[PDB]
């Protein structure tokens, strides 16, 4: 409701749309983050977009969903949760940087708590790993759609949006193939010099398996969502029915 609530702790990040703060609720110490939104520049025919979607992020409670707190117009402010381990786009610079796989471990966590958050997301009717933030607990978080919208060079550009098709809840899975797969690669499994080229690589299906010392299940299955045809990849329900994943690898707050 009013800024001179919270306690501005830092600046976590900055952008075209605004800047990101860790702040403290003065109410009972509660750690969050907002975003900080200059709206003065903007006309109303943006805002009837921005207002629009802003009240569409309350829906959705989620433990593998980033939370919504509150909302603030003084600069438009959007209090979200706090997501201490950052998002993992960072994380594969980093192992990227410091010559290091991810644990299969970790992969499977993302894997189980991203498809919880994609079967909460297709129950209601873009995942990259800037979009995907972890918290201190070893939990994993979706960003809201509508908060990124707001706020070769795809790769994760499903053959469906490419050969023109419908959208459907399977491009979904390719999506999130691409990105565990880049999770565990430290590189999306197709790339080019060009998108025309890279529409070439994604048509004709091929890549590199992922790194040796992922086992052959977990390869089997990131293989699997990387189909061409969107009926042969799995389901959410088949992924989370896999012997791979199990309660540990779930949310734990
Ligand atoms: C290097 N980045 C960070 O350390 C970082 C941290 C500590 N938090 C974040 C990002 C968020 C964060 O902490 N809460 C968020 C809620 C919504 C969105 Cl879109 C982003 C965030 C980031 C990018």
Same mark, same amino acid.
């Given at each position: ?8 702790? /830092? ?14 609720? $003065?109410?009972? &110490?509660?750690?969050?983050?907002? $975003?900080?939104?200059?709206? &003065?520049?903007? #006309?109303? %025919? ?8 802003? @009240? +569409?992020?309350?829906?959705?409670? *989620? !433990?593998?969903?980033?939370? /919504? ?5 003084? #600069? ?6 706090? =997501?201490? &381990? &950052? ?5 594969? #610079? ?17 894997? #189980? ?16 790993? %800037? ?22 060079? !795809? ?7 490419? @050969? ?13 193939? =691409?990105?565990?797969?880049?999770? =565990?690669?430290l590189m999306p499994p197709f790339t080019a010099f060009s998108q025309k080229e890279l529409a070439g690589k994604i048509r ?13 299940? +977990? @390869? ?6 990387? @189909?061409?045809?969107? /009926?042969?990849?799995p389901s959410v329900e088949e992924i989370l029915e896999n012997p791979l994943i199990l309660e540990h690898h779930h949310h734990? *707050?």
């Amino acid at each position: 409701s009013r800024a001179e609530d919270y306690e501005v702790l /830092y600046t976590i990040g900055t952008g075209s749309y605004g800047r990101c703060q860790k702040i403290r609720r $003065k109410s009972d &110490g509660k750690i969050l983050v907002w $975003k900080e939104l200059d709206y &003065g520049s903007m #006309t109303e %025919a943006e805002k009837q977009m921005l207002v629009s979607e802003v @009240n +569409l992020l309350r829906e959705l409670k *989620h !433990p593998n969903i980033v939370r /919504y707190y509150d909302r603030i117009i003084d #600069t438009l402010y959007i209090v979200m949760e706090y =997501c201490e &381990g &950052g998002d993992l786009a960072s994380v594969i #610079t980093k192992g990227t940087k410091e010559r290091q796989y991810l644990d299969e471990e970790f992969v499977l966590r993302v894997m #189980t708590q991203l498809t919880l958050a994609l079967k909460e997301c297709h129950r209601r009717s873009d995942l990259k790993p %800037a979009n995907v933030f972890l918290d201190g607990k070893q939990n994993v978080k979706l960003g809201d759609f509508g908060l990124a919208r707001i706020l070769g060079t !795809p790769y994760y550009m499903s053959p469906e949006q490419m @050969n023109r098709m419908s959208y459907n809840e399977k491009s979904d899975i390719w999506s999130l193939g =691409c990105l565990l797969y880049e999770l =565990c690669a430290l590189m999306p499994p197709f790339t080019a010099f060009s998108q025309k080229e890279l529409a070439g690589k994604i048509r004709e299906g091929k890549f590199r398996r992922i790194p040796y010392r992922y086992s052959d299940e +977990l @390869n089997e299955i990131i293989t699997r969502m990387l @189909n061409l045809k969107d /009926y042969h990849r799995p389901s959410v329900e088949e992924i989370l029915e896999n012997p791979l994943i199990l309660e540990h690898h779930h949310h734990h *707050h």
